[PDB]
């Protein structure tokens, strides 16, 4: 049940200076990048073109190339239209793509954020604001919705091109997506706070508990999922204890890579 995401980040420092950098995810794996420096979109996997032909990709990439230059000027022009209401520095962020469900099913999204706040989305056949958005965006919205050519394209990208393309990727990148890598664990400390480190595991779901015998220590504080450079994950569980009460304590780890045989580290 995977989600496809095109994250775009755009900084406008003043009226002349700006930059736009994109990255593309399918689940937790990066599939594309597009720096301001690059004139063309870069693959970060062998299977990133998907099941598209070379000529289909070219016409798609050229659409983006032209969008990126057009996007920049339009924002700059919308700042002139609203000024002195708004001025630089301005930080616009897009998040677009589709989520894939079994059978035929998929939903598409395109969400836009102004200065870190979700304010606008494409929905149906038009741009519209969301609840919470300031009312001055109404004019920018009115102007963007006048562009009947842009609407027809965005509709085609959300409704057809994206969900089609993602099916291509899912088939084309089966072995990378369904990969199984094993965690490695180790113990440490800093009342005392024992720490059970786990690292190198994929996919993301994992179970980590402190134990005495068969008895789950419900004081265990689970940390966050932190990424490793090699596209694996990291996670630590901590437990507070009395000094000289570390005897009998073990860290148990379950993960789909291990297949029954769980990692147990004793103190």
């Amino acid at each position, epitope marked *: 049940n995977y989600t496809f995401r095109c994250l775009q980040m755009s900084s406008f420092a003043n009226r002349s200076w700006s930059r736009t950098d994109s990255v593309v995810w399918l689940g937790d794996l990066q599939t594309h990048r597009w720096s301001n420096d690059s004139a063309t979109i870069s693959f970060t996997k062998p299977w990133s073109q998907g099941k598209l032909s070379n000529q289909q990709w070219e016409k798609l990439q050229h659409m983006f190339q*032209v969008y990126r230059v*057009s996007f920049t*000027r*339009d924002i700059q*022009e*919308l700042v*002139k*239209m609203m*000024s002195p209401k708004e001025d630089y520095p301005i930080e616009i962020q897009l998040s677009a793509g589709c989520e894939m469900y079994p059978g035929n099913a998929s939903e598409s999204f395109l969400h836009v954020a102004f200065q870190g706040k979700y304010v606008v989305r494409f929905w149906g056949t038009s741009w519209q604001t969301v609840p919470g958005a300031p009312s001055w965006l109404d004019l920018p919205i*009115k*102007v*963007l919705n*006048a*562009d*009947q*050519g*842009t609407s027809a394209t965005v509709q085609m990208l959300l409704n057809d091109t994206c969900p089609l393309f993602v099916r291509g990727l899912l088939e084309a990148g089966k072995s990378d997506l369904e990969k199984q890598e094993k965690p490695v664990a180790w113990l440490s400390s800093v009342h005392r706070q024992l720490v059970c480190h786990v690292s190198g595991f994929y996919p993301k779901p994992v179970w980590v508990m402190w134990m005495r015998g068969d008895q789950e220590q419900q004081g265990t504080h689970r940390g966050d999922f932190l990424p490793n450079a090699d596209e694996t994950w990291y996670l630590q569980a901590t437990l507070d204890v009395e000094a000289g009460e570390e005897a009998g304590l073990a860290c148990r780890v379950k993960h789909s890579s291990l297949g029954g045989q769980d990692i147990i580290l004793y103190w």
Partner: T-cell receptor
Amino acid sequence: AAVTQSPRNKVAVTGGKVTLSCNQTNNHNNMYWYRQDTGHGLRLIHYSYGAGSTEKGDIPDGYKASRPSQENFSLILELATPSQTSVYFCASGDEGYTQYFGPGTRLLVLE
Amino acid sequence: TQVEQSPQSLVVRQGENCVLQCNYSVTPDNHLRWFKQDTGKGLVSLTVLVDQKDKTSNGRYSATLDKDAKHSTLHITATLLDDTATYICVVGDRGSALGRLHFGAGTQLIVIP
């Protein structure tokens, strides 16, 4: 959707202040000033997205612009020069792509 | 100079047809407009083409646009004396007010009565 310019024709001396004005009863937010020279197409001098806004266009040097209200967008030549001898077109528009053009204004700047 | 017109000028006898050219490098290309400027007067619109492969008519004026080639022609069937004018090509790079218009220099038609 009509637009008017004034004066329609003007003779001026080098160094004089010359002011070209453009009136529009369309409630169009946006207004534009161009100049046509035999040889080139229309080139944008200044424009305005509403009362109080004025923007530099493509060839803005020598022209100041003034949008005091929704109806009037003015082009001011503070120090007129022979190089500003041209035909000046004004236009207006709403949120869409069309710009509704004025009838043109001829200016001759003499020595 | 992202909009070129051809010929620069032409003379034709009243009754003859003529085809005017307009090629452009403008990106993107939302729409293309043909204007008509009488000597002294201002800009009368003839047509606006908006599609990838578009065609229009306006009585004796008919026109085409190919956005892949980035090329447009304006045909005048059965020229009359009033057609003595300059014919301007204009490409708009957006389908909204955010865009700029890029003007051609113009093709000068002169019609012999």
